[PDB]
Amino acid sequence: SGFRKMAFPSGKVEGCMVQVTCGTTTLNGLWLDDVVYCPRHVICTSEDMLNPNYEDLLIRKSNHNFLVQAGNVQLRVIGHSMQNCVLKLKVDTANPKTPKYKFVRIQPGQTFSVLACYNGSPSGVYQCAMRPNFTIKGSFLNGSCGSVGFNIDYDCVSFCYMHHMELPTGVHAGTDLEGNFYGPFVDRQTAQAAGTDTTITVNVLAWLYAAVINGDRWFLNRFTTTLNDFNLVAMKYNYEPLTQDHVDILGPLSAQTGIAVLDMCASLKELLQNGMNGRTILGSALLEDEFTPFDVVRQCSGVT
Amino acid sequence: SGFRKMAFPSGKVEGCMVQVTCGTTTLNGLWLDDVVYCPRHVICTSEDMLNPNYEDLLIRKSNHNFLVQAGNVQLRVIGHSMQNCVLKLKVDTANPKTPKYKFVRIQPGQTFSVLACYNGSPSGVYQCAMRPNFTIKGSFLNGSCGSVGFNIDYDCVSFCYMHHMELPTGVHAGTDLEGNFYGPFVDRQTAQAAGTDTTITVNVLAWLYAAVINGDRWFLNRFTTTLNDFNLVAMKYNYEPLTQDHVDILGPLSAQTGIAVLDMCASLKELLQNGMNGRTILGSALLEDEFTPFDVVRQCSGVT
Ligand SMILES: *CC(=O)N1CCN(Cc2ccsc2)CC1
Ligand SMILES: *CC(=O)N1CCN(Cc2ccsc2)CC1
């Protein structure tokens, strides 16, 4: 029993982290096979970050300008290219610790673990979600860029995030491992405001199921609702509209607990309308939305 | 910027996890050098757990009864002994992935990371604290026993926790790596109630400092207080009494922010007395007490 914000074991990713230095800029790189992936802004001076022309800046760089260090061992760069907002540095040695991996571009509401690194050295691991506004709420200081987000299915690491920038509101933006930003963000020091941070309704419901499975049942009520009625309430509270797809995905949690998805929606509706009245649910005083239905089933079933 | 509940990178510990089977019971073991550490209740049938005599039960067990599997490779047991509530199984092979390590017995209020494992296989990592009642609030299903809690200082893993049991209130009890339970708990299926779960005042203050460092300042007020006055308020709200030792430990955070510890106590006092009024602090609607001053400085300074 008990339910905790839980990250994937980080070892498989720790083995992929290197330091990338271009001139006087240091950040993190991801070494998979004989390629090191890092944010292209490694090539920039802070001066450059106001309106960088990355193709023009990159012409001035040679393979020997990219200093790549794995532990205290230097890797030899034999090639470099820009793909969108990331650099791929070809090194002369395959990473012996390369796990099975995939590159995946996640959707908003999807959760992942982040291994925060400084100088190619892991400092810690925490769990994130891709917000509906394509930001993530991270913990990232200067030097953390190139830190990656990932899911693990048994032996296969699916890399979904690379950290690139902090908005002046202290939220985080980055790319998939093809170097394409999530959302409308650009790797330039300009005016970039996040949109509405809407609550991931399907994740909140999954977490309410997790609460019931673990003894927290006080918010269960005598009511039911319809998708259309629930959604009127979701609209008012900046929740994502609930779809039949969300209802289907919650089916296993519905089945295990014997609480109809729409009944749990009517519970969520009363919580939105009435608040927690100073009570808590799984040790939280607000409605947690960074557990997916898949996350809840995993943690409740003990999958490795 | 941003501040997240953050666990140590788990790789060094992932490399120490094995499966221990005695008869029909399977749980996790910790392989350091040529010793595997596991909870002694591995030797029990559920029948045995009502009033086990571990010394009597252990006489019936030989080295060949302890099945120890690291990945898909079996380790040869060449010796076994009981130390308090843990078994030490001597194996004929040193774990090649043994990190630098220490065994430490932590105090209440101290935080650590847990690598939840099933069948010697890591499922995830999360951050805990030793509660003032010597429970921890974990995420642990059947088969998770022998999962360990740890801190990392650069290269050295300090093992502080091994998971042994769940109280019928869904909180967790376990041992240091010498097999001594935290608090009054025993590895028997009997009536064991947790004491008062008091709030770790020094951790809450550290987290309020983390909030200021990251832009959340709305709760800063015009007041100050004294230790004695603050403590009257802590008593009423089941907070640990604040000592000069706690004030000293918060000195670096005081220094960096320019907010006197006692001023921050007067902020905490108003929050205890008035509530959050539906506001949040670092994305929480309650007062977080599972970040130590050391944790806040680490995450705010980017130590690896
Ligand atoms: C994540 C990280 O380490 N940093 C430091 C370098 N910064 C360069 C930049 C990119 C967009 S605006 C300026 C990014 C944050
Ligand atoms: C942690 C874990 O896997 N388990 C399963 C075995 N249980 C045995 C027991 C110990 C005290 S009461 C019964 C403990 C929980």
XYZ file of C-alpha atoms and ligand atoms in Angstrom:
638
model
C 0.000 0.000 0.000
C 0.921 3.697 -0.215
C 1.207 5.737 -3.418
C 4.177 8.000 -4.209
C 5.324 10.215 -7.096
C 7.683 7.632 -8.538
C 10.355 7.915 -11.270
C 11.877 5.117 -13.343
C 15.118 3.672 -12.044
C 17.694 6.025 -13.695
C 20.738 3.674 -14.091
C 20.204 2.899 -17.825
C 20.146 6.704 -18.534
C 22.962 7.564 -16.047
C 25.185 5.386 -18.314
C 24.319 7.655 -21.323
C 25.171 11.037 -19.739
C 28.250 12.963 -20.945
C 29.564 16.539 -20.717
C 29.572 18.651 -23.937
C 31.711 21.822 -24.074
C 31.722 24.156 -27.091
C 34.142 27.079 -26.502
C 33.110 28.318 -23.034
C 29.540 26.793 -22.841
C 29.082 23.407 -20.965
C 25.905 21.323 -20.863
C 24.813 17.688 -20.931
C 24.769 15.268 -23.839
C 23.105 11.906 -24.368
C 25.528 9.211 -25.714
C 23.610 6.409 -27.552
C 25.617 4.067 -29.787
C 28.265 6.358 -31.448
C 26.151 9.555 -31.356
C 26.027 12.266 -28.648
C 22.774 14.318 -28.661
C 22.830 17.827 -27.074
C 20.936 21.142 -27.437
C 22.315 23.178 -30.369
C 22.577 26.292 -28.072
C 25.831 24.649 -26.785
C 27.470 26.623 -29.685
C 26.152 30.014 -28.337
C 27.688 32.739 -26.164
C 24.968 34.413 -23.922
C 25.421 37.365 -26.405
C 24.431 34.965 -29.275
C 21.156 33.884 -27.462
C 19.242 37.132 -28.308
C 18.756 36.285 -32.041
C 21.046 33.339 -32.905
C 21.401 32.115 -36.548
C 22.362 28.534 -35.613
C 23.366 27.545 -39.197
C 25.663 30.627 -39.421
C 27.100 29.972 -35.888
C 27.701 26.301 -36.668
C 29.843 27.063 -39.827
C 32.478 28.458 -37.357
C 32.618 25.128 -35.416
C 34.714 22.046 -36.323
C 34.518 18.468 -34.868
C 37.533 19.382 -32.581
C 35.558 22.360 -31.079
C 33.024 19.953 -29.449
C 34.686 18.661 -26.219
C 32.835 15.445 -25.183
C 33.795 13.844 -21.866
C 32.285 10.598 -20.453
C 33.451 10.324 -16.841
C 37.130 11.425 -17.027
C 37.566 9.902 -20.580
C 37.394 12.201 -23.658
C 35.454 11.010 -26.746
C 36.825 11.727 -30.235
C 34.274 13.673 -32.398
C 34.385 12.418 -36.049
C 31.299 14.287 -37.293
C 28.556 16.778 -36.344
C 25.187 17.829 -37.752
C 22.193 19.911 -36.654
C 18.750 18.186 -36.670
C 16.126 20.861 -35.754
C 17.236 22.196 -32.299
C 19.734 19.383 -31.373
C 23.302 18.558 -32.394
C 24.286 14.972 -33.145
C 28.038 14.550 -32.538
C 29.373 11.320 -34.152
C 32.064 9.881 -31.812
C 34.554 7.088 -32.761
C 33.339 4.791 -29.873
C 29.899 3.205 -29.320
C 28.733 3.784 -25.712
C 29.193 0.313 -24.151
C 26.318 1.153 -21.732
C 23.848 1.953 -24.559
C 20.524 0.390 -23.450
C 17.788 -0.682 -25.833
C 16.135 2.662 -26.622
C 13.537 4.444 -28.763
C 12.989 8.156 -29.447
C 9.303 9.001 -28.859
C 7.445 12.340 -29.064
C 4.918 12.281 -26.202
C 1.474 13.964 -26.086
C 0.344 16.425 -23.408
C -0.824 14.594 -20.226
C 1.923 11.901 -20.644
C 4.334 11.531 -17.702
C 8.088 10.818 -17.790
C 11.084 10.724 -15.467
C 13.849 13.406 -15.704
C 17.481 12.716 -14.785
C 18.738 16.212 -13.862
C 22.477 16.392 -14.737
C 25.225 19.065 -14.421
C 28.572 18.583 -16.296
C 27.391 15.113 -17.577
C 26.928 14.067 -13.862
C 23.506 13.037 -12.570
C 22.245 15.055 -9.548
C 18.755 13.521 -9.164
C 15.580 11.989 -10.630
C 11.951 13.236 -10.478
C 8.689 12.633 -12.353
C 7.207 15.195 -14.808
C 4.273 15.510 -17.187
C 4.081 17.260 -20.575
C 1.574 20.021 -19.583
C -1.366 20.822 -21.944
C 0.498 24.098 -22.731
C 3.631 21.999 -23.781
C 5.673 23.236 -20.802
C 6.857 20.880 -18.032
C 7.308 21.813 -14.382
C 10.943 20.811 -13.810
C 13.902 21.485 -11.488
C 16.643 22.839 -13.769
C 19.536 25.261 -13.011
C 22.108 26.671 -15.486
C 24.153 23.715 -16.811
C 21.129 21.312 -16.634
C 20.370 21.710 -20.384
C 20.710 18.406 -22.285
C 19.239 16.530 -19.289
C 16.655 14.118 -20.700
C 13.181 12.787 -19.888
C 12.331 9.137 -20.448
C 9.958 6.228 -19.837
C 11.174 2.602 -19.400
C 9.289 -0.499 -20.687
C 11.224 -3.407 -19.001
C 14.617 -3.092 -20.831
C 13.776 -0.359 -23.452
C 14.290 3.356 -22.569
C 11.968 5.653 -24.591
C 13.572 9.101 -24.633
C 10.856 11.791 -24.979
C 12.473 15.036 -23.621
C 15.710 17.035 -23.754
C 15.854 20.178 -21.576
C 16.521 23.447 -23.469
C 15.176 26.557 -21.672
C 13.357 28.138 -18.701
C 10.540 30.693 -19.335
C 10.757 33.841 -17.110
C 7.720 32.298 -15.213
C 10.076 29.448 -14.081
C 8.528 26.605 -16.186
C 10.483 24.532 -18.689
C 10.601 23.950 -22.444
C 12.495 21.434 -24.528
C 12.592 19.093 -27.463
C 12.010 15.454 -28.294
C 15.251 13.666 -29.319
C 14.666 14.742 -33.004
C 15.241 18.317 -31.716
C 11.613 19.480 -32.285
C 10.327 21.684 -29.396
C 7.202 20.687 -27.561
C 4.735 23.472 -28.230
C 5.576 26.829 -29.846
C 8.867 27.502 -27.972
C 12.133 28.522 -29.706
C 15.762 28.326 -28.356
C 16.177 32.142 -28.314
C 16.190 34.646 -25.371
C 12.875 36.372 -26.370
C 9.279 36.949 -25.081
C 7.778 33.457 -24.737
C 4.697 33.201 -22.475
C 3.128 29.797 -21.591
C -0.583 29.340 -22.393
C -3.213 28.223 -19.833
C -1.884 25.411 -17.597
C -5.047 23.282 -17.783
C -5.425 20.264 -15.422
C -5.080 16.787 -17.028
C -8.582 15.475 -16.103
C -7.846 11.793 -17.039
C -4.760 11.831 -14.744
C -6.734 13.295 -11.824
C -9.356 10.512 -12.195
C -6.585 7.860 -12.362
C -5.127 9.329 -9.131
C -8.609 9.279 -7.444
C -8.752 5.553 -8.366
C -5.220 5.176 -6.798
C -6.611 6.890 -3.658
C -9.560 4.439 -3.406
C -7.200 1.425 -4.035
C -5.070 2.702 -1.037
C -7.851 3.485 1.520
C -8.610 7.214 0.856
C -12.373 7.047 0.029
C -13.926 10.087 1.892
C -14.556 11.957 -1.458
C -16.643 9.048 -2.948
C -20.266 10.347 -3.110
C -23.811 9.187 -4.066
C -23.831 11.049 -7.426
C -23.166 10.312 -11.050
C -22.821 12.582 -14.082
C -22.537 12.477 -17.918
C -19.458 13.414 -20.017
C -21.333 16.556 -21.273
C -22.325 17.620 -17.712
C -18.855 16.870 -16.238
C -17.265 18.890 -19.098
C -19.382 21.999 -18.248
C -17.667 21.797 -14.797
C -14.216 20.987 -16.336
C -14.536 24.083 -18.627
C -15.253 26.351 -15.605
C -12.154 25.002 -13.662
C -9.653 24.910 -16.678
C -9.710 21.073 -16.834
C -9.217 19.254 -20.189
C -12.564 18.047 -21.630
C -13.094 14.305 -20.825
C -13.537 12.133 -23.941
C -14.831 8.581 -24.380
C -11.128 7.769 -25.146
C -10.255 8.887 -21.546
C -13.245 6.819 -20.210
C -11.978 3.732 -22.124
C -8.382 4.185 -20.791
C -9.775 4.322 -17.206
C -11.700 1.022 -17.787
C -9.134 -1.247 -16.004
C -9.169 1.032 -12.870
C -13.017 1.145 -13.035
C -13.023 -2.698 -13.281
C -10.625 -3.271 -10.351
C -12.406 -0.813 -7.974
C -16.024 -1.409 -9.164
C -16.524 2.395 -9.436
C -18.015 3.442 -12.828
C -15.812 6.122 -14.498
C -18.817 8.538 -14.550
C -19.393 8.024 -10.792
C -15.729 8.971 -10.185
C -16.295 12.049 -12.495
C -19.223 13.044 -10.198
C -16.802 12.712 -7.214
C -14.260 14.923 -9.061
C -17.111 17.368 -9.938
C -18.025 17.754 -6.185
C -14.300 18.236 -5.291
C -13.972 20.972 -7.957
C -17.195 22.661 -6.727
C -16.656 22.245 -2.952
C -12.843 21.994 -2.477
C -11.100 19.531 -0.107
C -12.506 21.367 3.014
C -8.941 21.152 4.493
C -8.781 17.372 3.951
C -6.094 15.481 1.966
C -6.074 12.627 -0.648
C -2.929 10.438 -0.844
C -1.160 13.109 1.300
C -2.043 15.935 -1.177
C -4.270 19.003 -0.457
C -4.845 19.538 -4.207
C -5.933 17.275 -7.124
C -2.759 15.526 -8.546
C -2.744 15.355 -12.365
C 0.801 13.937 -13.130
C -0.128 10.250 -12.778
C -1.440 8.575 -15.994
C -3.869 5.660 -15.771
C -0.852 3.529 -16.925
C 1.266 4.993 -14.019
C -1.484 4.143 -11.448
C -1.849 0.517 -12.732
C 1.993 0.092 -12.758
C 2.527 1.391 -9.191
C -0.591 -0.448 -7.887
C 0.529 -3.783 -9.625
C 4.373 -3.604 -9.001
C 5.642 -3.905 -12.650
C 9.493 -4.025 -13.183
C 14.530 27.454 -11.275
C 11.720 25.131 -10.148
C 11.829 22.804 -7.135
C 10.795 19.133 -7.278
C 10.701 16.151 -4.900
C 13.942 14.660 -6.160
C 15.566 11.252 -5.500
C 19.218 10.288 -5.923
C 20.137 8.706 -9.230
C 19.447 4.982 -8.488
C 22.017 3.250 -10.800
C 24.629 2.513 -8.068
C 21.868 0.758 -5.999
C 20.177 -0.920 -9.029
C 23.517 -2.789 -9.446
C 23.174 -4.178 -5.854
C 19.630 -5.602 -6.139
C 19.116 -9.394 -6.171
C 16.215 -11.816 -5.633
C 16.236 -13.948 -2.427
C 13.983 -17.036 -2.234
C 13.709 -19.179 0.909
C 11.300 -22.110 0.315
C 8.238 -20.371 -1.178
C 8.908 -16.738 0.027
C 10.615 -14.259 -2.451
C 11.851 -10.763 -1.616
C 14.742 -8.437 -2.416
C 18.327 -8.593 -1.216
C 21.167 -6.087 -1.255
C 24.458 -7.548 -2.665
C 27.519 -5.576 -1.379
C 30.947 -7.189 -1.767
C 30.324 -10.952 -1.081
C 27.347 -10.447 1.282
C 23.609 -10.348 0.437
C 21.482 -8.486 3.046
C 17.724 -9.302 3.245
C 14.929 -9.207 5.870
C 15.040 -12.327 8.083
C 11.246 -12.872 7.490
C 12.338 -14.389 4.107
C 12.517 -17.686 6.129
C 8.801 -17.416 7.210
C 5.568 -18.906 5.855
C 2.591 -16.436 6.362
C 1.574 -18.978 9.116
C 4.994 -18.346 10.815
C 4.451 -14.487 10.844
C 1.973 -14.541 13.808
C 4.652 -15.289 16.484
C 7.867 -16.346 14.692
C 10.921 -17.603 16.690
C 13.495 -16.594 14.050
C 16.411 -18.455 15.743
C 14.298 -21.672 15.877
C 13.099 -21.190 12.230
C 16.639 -20.531 11.012
C 18.029 -23.862 12.467
C 15.881 -25.611 9.763
C 17.586 -23.624 6.931
C 20.911 -24.484 5.223
C 23.042 -22.314 2.835
C 21.442 -24.258 -0.135
C 17.895 -23.218 1.027
C 18.647 -19.515 0.257
C 18.169 -19.084 -3.545
C 20.007 -15.859 -4.574
C 19.642 -14.691 -8.178
C 21.344 -11.585 -9.684
C 19.750 -10.999 -13.090
C 19.440 -14.551 -14.529
C 22.703 -15.718 -12.760
C 22.467 -17.721 -9.485
C 24.879 -16.873 -6.625
C 26.383 -19.681 -4.523
C 25.616 -19.214 -0.760
C 28.667 -20.259 1.367
C 27.388 -18.952 4.717
C 24.440 -17.304 6.512
C 23.888 -15.503 9.812
C 21.163 -13.425 11.473
C 22.131 -9.899 12.684
C 19.065 -8.436 14.512
C 16.221 -8.509 11.894
C 18.374 -9.080 8.724
C 20.096 -12.103 7.192
C 23.602 -11.783 5.778
C 24.125 -14.471 3.108
C 27.856 -14.925 2.278
C 28.128 -15.641 -1.491
C 31.290 -16.959 -3.268
C 31.441 -13.888 -5.643
C 31.982 -10.194 -4.798
C 29.371 -8.026 -6.584
C 31.445 -6.397 -9.367
C 29.037 -3.395 -9.238
C 29.592 -2.801 -5.486
C 29.825 1.009 -5.104
C 31.645 2.748 -2.280
C 29.093 2.462 0.538
C 28.442 3.043 4.246
C 25.678 1.741 6.528
C 24.160 4.681 8.451
C 21.264 4.800 10.949
C 19.403 8.050 10.204
C 17.485 10.268 12.675
C 13.834 11.286 12.303
C 13.445 14.248 9.872
C 16.269 12.890 7.603
C 15.289 12.218 3.970
C 16.434 9.368 1.695
C 15.644 7.857 -1.692
C 13.933 4.408 -1.963
C 14.490 2.051 -4.904
C 11.268 -0.016 -4.879
C 12.104 -3.523 -6.210
C 10.096 -6.734 -6.883
C 11.973 -10.052 -7.529
C 15.380 -8.201 -7.322
C 14.146 -5.921 -10.218
C 13.827 -2.170 -9.705
C 10.335 -0.731 -10.434
C 10.919 2.916 -9.417
C 12.558 5.566 -7.210
C 10.955 8.125 -4.837
C 12.039 10.313 -1.912
C 11.067 9.535 1.727
C 11.713 10.885 5.210
C 12.098 8.994 8.505
C 8.936 10.357 10.248
C 9.170 11.524 13.914
C 7.148 8.363 14.777
C 9.879 6.196 12.998
C 7.503 5.203 10.181
C 8.091 6.270 6.556
C 5.383 6.978 3.995
C 6.389 4.606 1.184
C 4.960 2.818 -1.877
C 5.462 -0.895 -1.160
C 3.438 -3.949 -2.338
C 3.977 -7.622 -1.363
C 7.419 -8.658 -2.685
C 8.898 -5.131 -2.117
C 10.521 -6.157 1.217
C 14.336 -5.876 1.113
C 14.045 -2.718 -1.033
C 16.460 -0.183 0.459
C 16.645 3.541 1.235
C 19.851 5.477 0.658
C 21.597 8.841 0.349
C 24.516 9.460 -2.083
C 27.527 11.743 -1.339
C 29.266 11.977 -4.798
C 30.468 8.321 -5.184
C 29.532 6.880 -1.706
C 26.051 5.323 -1.158
C 24.947 5.518 2.518
C 22.340 2.799 3.043
C 19.941 3.830 5.857
C 16.737 1.740 5.265
C 15.596 -1.784 4.386
C 11.828 -2.290 3.957
C 10.256 -4.902 6.286
C 6.522 -4.317 6.939
C 3.343 -2.263 6.380
C 1.200 -1.210 9.407
C -2.588 -1.760 8.904
C -2.764 2.120 8.557
C -0.712 1.764 5.299
C 2.579 3.338 6.563
C 5.925 1.556 6.508
C 8.479 0.195 8.975
C 11.953 -1.195 8.469
C 15.507 -1.509 9.643
C 18.888 0.094 9.123
C 21.364 -2.277 7.390
C 22.415 -3.691 10.850
C 18.835 -5.080 11.012
C 17.696 -2.776 13.881
C 14.119 -1.444 13.338
C 13.516 2.265 13.301
C 11.249 2.923 16.254
C 9.476 0.245 18.319
C 8.338 -1.994 15.407
C 8.887 -5.789 15.300
C 8.800 -8.170 12.241
C 5.682 -10.020 13.504
C 2.005 -9.858 12.328
C 0.679 -8.208 15.566
C -0.989 -4.955 16.817
C 1.503 -2.185 15.995
C 0.059 1.363 15.915
C 2.174 4.370 14.769
C 2.488 7.297 17.209
C 1.653 10.935 16.321
C 2.930 11.850 12.828
C 4.362 15.239 13.849
C 5.510 17.697 11.116
C 9.307 18.161 10.724
C 9.411 21.945 11.438
C 13.063 22.435 10.257
C 12.192 20.785 6.894
C 9.118 22.994 6.409
C 11.264 26.122 7.009
C 13.920 24.827 4.558
C 11.135 24.324 1.967
C 9.782 27.891 2.613
C 13.344 29.130 1.886
C 13.274 26.988 -1.352
C 9.950 28.703 -2.218
C 11.438 32.218 -1.765
C 14.590 31.222 -3.795
C 12.182 30.147 -6.659
C 9.759 33.150 -6.705
C 6.941 32.022 -4.316
C 7.023 34.867 -1.713
C 3.283 35.678 -1.022
C 3.487 34.116 2.532
C 6.423 36.408 3.614
C 4.950 38.816 6.234
C 5.952 41.826 8.417
C 6.252 39.761 11.641
C 8.935 38.062 13.650
C 8.768 35.663 16.597
C 10.994 33.942 19.222
C 11.786 30.189 19.454
C 9.626 29.982 22.656
C 6.663 31.796 21.003
C 6.944 29.817 17.719
C 7.057 26.558 19.758
C 3.739 27.403 21.530
C 2.248 27.442 17.971
C 4.225 24.303 16.891
C 2.880 22.418 19.986
C -0.744 23.308 19.057
C -0.276 22.062 15.393
C 1.790 18.833 16.206
C 5.036 20.349 14.824
C 8.443 19.332 16.298
C 9.776 22.004 18.710
C 12.353 24.257 16.918
C 15.793 24.249 18.588
C 18.791 26.561 18.205
C 20.382 23.523 16.417
C 17.605 23.789 13.735
C 18.177 27.616 13.566
C 21.945 27.040 13.050
C 21.327 24.421 10.281
C 19.063 26.944 8.460
C 21.846 29.621 8.628
C 23.089 29.119 5.007
C 19.486 29.486 3.628
C 18.963 32.553 5.901
C 22.271 33.994 4.555
C 21.464 33.410 0.857
C 17.891 34.845 1.063
C 18.546 37.597 3.682
C 15.486 36.383 5.672
C 16.278 35.844 9.401
C 15.277 32.289 10.491
C 12.905 33.785 13.137
C 11.193 35.963 10.482
C 10.574 32.801 8.407
C 9.221 31.119 11.642
C 6.746 34.055 11.953
C 5.713 33.377 8.299
C 5.243 29.659 9.147
C 3.318 30.687 12.327
C 0.821 32.783 10.220
C 0.437 29.871 7.714
C -0.318 27.445 10.586
C -2.822 29.922 12.119
C -4.473 31.147 8.880
C -4.010 28.287 6.343
C -3.039 28.777 2.663
C -6.454 30.447 1.868
C -6.604 28.178 -1.259
C -3.164 29.340 -2.453
C -0.153 27.086 -3.217
C 3.638 27.168 -2.442
C 5.977 25.367 -4.892
C 2.837 23.693 -6.374
C 1.741 22.307 -2.942
C -1.488 23.208 -1.030
C 0.046 21.975 2.258
C 3.365 22.616 4.098
C 6.017 20.127 2.709
C 8.252 18.662 5.443
C 10.321 15.996 3.500
C 13.048 18.375 2.281
C 16.014 18.847 4.699
C 17.970 22.105 4.703
C 20.770 20.006 3.051
C 18.256 18.830 0.336
C 17.179 22.464 -0.388
C 20.826 23.702 -0.688
C 21.711 20.689 -2.942
C 18.757 21.150 -5.341
C 19.140 24.979 -5.326
C 22.997 24.694 -5.989
C 23.027 21.697 -8.482
C 25.445 19.316 -6.612
C 26.357 15.971 -8.377
C 19.307 24.673 -19.362
C 20.573 25.501 -19.233
O 21.592 24.991 -18.782
N 20.562 26.786 -19.643
C 21.767 27.604 -19.747
C 21.946 28.079 -21.171
N 20.778 28.832 -21.639
C 20.968 29.260 -23.026
C 19.711 29.841 -23.621
C 18.734 29.130 -24.381
C 17.613 29.841 -24.629
S 17.707 31.388 -23.960
C 19.313 31.163 -23.460
C 19.580 27.994 -21.502
C 19.390 27.538 -20.075
C 7.370 -6.056 2.227
C 6.788 -7.380 1.769
O 7.099 -7.838 0.675
N 5.949 -8.047 2.588
C 5.494 -9.411 2.331
C 5.905 -10.315 3.469
N 5.383 -9.838 4.754
C 5.814 -10.719 5.841
C 5.490 -10.149 7.198
C 6.362 -9.362 8.010
C 5.759 -8.819 9.089
S 4.127 -9.247 9.162
C 4.256 -10.285 7.825
C 5.837 -8.459 4.975
C 5.406 -7.552 3.848
